[PDB]
């Protein structure tokens, strides 16, 4: 046997109980904010194709 | 200065990046990029991130160290610029051995290098490299759930393969029966269904980002004041956990054909099956040993990084001692004895979740990360609040 | 050279735009903006 494994497993999941932990309204406010940020980062892929594709080559059938 | 200014410096960089996008190439390189060089992309992130992490490994190492001077800062920046060209020349010459992109690449490494330094100074967090990572990841999740112009997996029965899209199938599918069930015609990976699962795993990581500890903390000479220290549960910024999982798979698989000069199927298979093969897998024992090996690897990169380039015992001790912090019931020194425990256990149990992002690929639609887009969303929480405070 | 500590101002913005426009248009062979 190896001592440390068993103790690292203790000292890791009781130190999540020293953390302040999410409250209901505060889980909502981060959780709302996430969904916005990634719809902005969405838009990059769609628009820039129409300037790219007919300049790069004409064989595309569109 | 102004929060109105501070957004302008972000628009500049935003729109510019928006138009823009061993002995073999690396896996992780594909992750951060999302075009693998287009016709205007001209490796827009690659050099900056390769240069910053080679240099951080050199810098953190005890042999040379950043002092408090202007001068070590200057040379570290200079050092990163010089590496960044080197890596792009090193790469690019190989694909040549054609007239158009070689000439263009040199003009495009002149844009990027000062630009990246326009958002570490002109904006607070993020970085130029962060903003780009976040956009490139968010890109490839959304394009396959709307209309891919290549092929739309999960549902088929068309062998056009060139206009098969999610919206395009939605029109033809109403003239027959549902395929929006748990039944699909060929079920390789239904792409509407893969997004529903994507946003689930995001939810459990942000829950643990709210987990962090703050301490109130007094000072030595005068006891009558109290300050604060925030201890963030996560460590190594999660970059050499995600990167180091990948770059050790490269150094086995490249070598196999290199050993031959001095076998794609069997050698790979028996050492590591890649990723999950579903909730039913494909291996009753080969997949198990791989997963257990993976989490061990990822847990171990964190415990080795902190001492030699990361923050641990000494790097935190140096910080407090400047302003002569002391504990209410104790002293300086013996905070250090309690973060000897915390830093390794928090760090590496942090890691065992950046690992359990990477194996998922059928409940996650991200191209490898995890880490890099999520550091971006945490940085939004910080700046979003700042904007609510000033507005109110 | 590398003597500048600060890297924000009007002037860097003009330099990034000026280059970005040659990259987009001048060197392309597809739209016949230079001939060989």
Residue numbers in the entry:
A (entry chain G): 7 to 68
B (entry chain A): 26 to 46, 58 to 133, 148 to 312, 337 to 466
C (entry chain B): 61 to 96
Task: Give the original sentences from the paper that presented this experimental model.
These processes are facilitated by the translocon, a multi-subunit complex located in the ER membrane.
Benefitting from these developments in direct detector technology, we obtained a subtomogram average of mainly idle mammalian ribosomes bound to the native translocon in rER vesicles at subnanometer resolution. Fourier shell cross-resolution with a cryo-EM single particle reconstruction of the human 80S ribosome18 indicates that the resolutions of the subtomogram averages derived from either idle (12,500 subtomograms) or translocating (5,100 subtomograms) ribosome-Sec61 complexes are 9.4 and 10.0 Å, respectively. The high cross-resolution of the density segments representing Sec61 in the two subtomogram averages (10.2 Å at FSC=0.5) as well as superposition of the atomic Sec61 model described below, suggest that the idle and translocating states of Sec61 are essentially indistinguishable at the resolution range of 9–10 Å in the native translocon. The initial model, resulting from the two described rigid body fits and the adjustment of TMH10 served as an initial model for molecular dynamics flexible fitting (MDFF). Compared with the starting model, the C-terminal domain of Sec61α and consequently the interaction with the ribosome remain largely unaltered with the exception of TMH10, which moves 13 Å towards the ribosome.
